[PDB]
Symmetry: C3
Subunit: 121 residues, 3 copies
């Protein structure tokens, strides 16, 4: 299954993340300041383009850094279905808000799945 | 060719990106503010170190996330020569400016090559 | 050894980096400004969550981008023990300070190990 698994995953990582950077592209502020919106459009955009992102930078980096020596398989459907599993839902969880209800979910995964994928090997 | 291909590629990604972070290192502002330049040096540096970067974070992350199950080869010289192909030229395209003439080019690649490298498999 | 090597490495990259993002999580400023601390807590946090990070984004990205065609082995214990080797010590080096004593160490590695891992192949 390291076959299918790596897959469904990644597509969400250029999609989730990337379906999102461009939709964050300048539906421009009435600009003057280069020489209500700005912050609270940026405060969505930057703050949104930030968290799609990093939630991957380790998460996904590690996401292979491990499978690079491709596991058994009975676990791996889980730890990888669970793996993206959260982080998907999670990405959907956090971009919407900004504060608490995600930092939590972002912790059990990146720290865990990684200590695991370290250890297990 | 997944041989040669991954290669020429990556080198540009620590070079392009990284030949660039250090050349962005502090040819210092006449500093006072830590306790014309600042913004418009940062507005080059941060704004330049930002876009070398992400244009990879997915792009390249995915760039393997796919080849990890190494394709045929008759396509792959293209989709990977075209792959870096743009993004090279592209990186050269965007860092220079800041606004429109690149966001475009950055879209057909990261979104495409990725839906593809998702699909094809 | 591309076996063991990739390994010890990565774990430090979700740990180093990630053991660190969450410990950077809001031991909140006495907040008012959303509508001494802020900057100098952020100036630690953002400025700390930034440099764990990128010191990997290429470094580690490339870190595999190469081993993806897994080297000999007599060199590889070095170039990879030396590889994380610095960057570990280095990450420990830079987050603590902010200015000079690291940018240096960050250069010989990311630029080198990468031109190398380009070339050698
Ligand atoms: N520090 C607050 C808010 C920062 C914030 O909630 N932004 C999120 C993104 S939407 C962020 O930068 N998080 C990245 C991180 O957790 O390091 C402010 O400056 O007003
Ligand atoms: N938002 C504008 C300019 C921002 C800008 O053009 N910077 C580019 C980098 S050179 C950027 O942050 N782009 C990253 C992105 O597209 O998310 C400002 O604050 O004056
Ligand atoms: N530019 C200075 C300080 C910036 C700084 O030292 N922050 C470090 C992180 S702790 C940084 O952003 N480095 C990232 C980089 O080198 O591009 C300021 O605005 O006061």
């Amino acid at each position: 299954n390291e076959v299918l698994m790596a897959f469904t995953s990644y597509a969400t990582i250029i999609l989730a993340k990337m379906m999102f950077l461009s939709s964050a592209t300048a539906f421009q502020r009435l600009t003057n300041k280069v020489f209500l919106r700005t912050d609270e459009k940026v405060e969505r955009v930057r703050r949104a383009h930030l968290n799609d992102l990093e939630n991957i930078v380790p998460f996904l980096g590690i996401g292979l850094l491990y499978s690079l020596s491709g596991p058994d398989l009975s676990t791996a459907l889980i730890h990888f279905r669970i793996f993206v599993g959260a982080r998907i839902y999670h990405t959907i969880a956090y971009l919407t808000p900004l504060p608490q209800p995600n930092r939590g979910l972002a912790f059990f995964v990146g720290y865990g799945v990684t200590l695991s994928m370290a250890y297990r090997l």
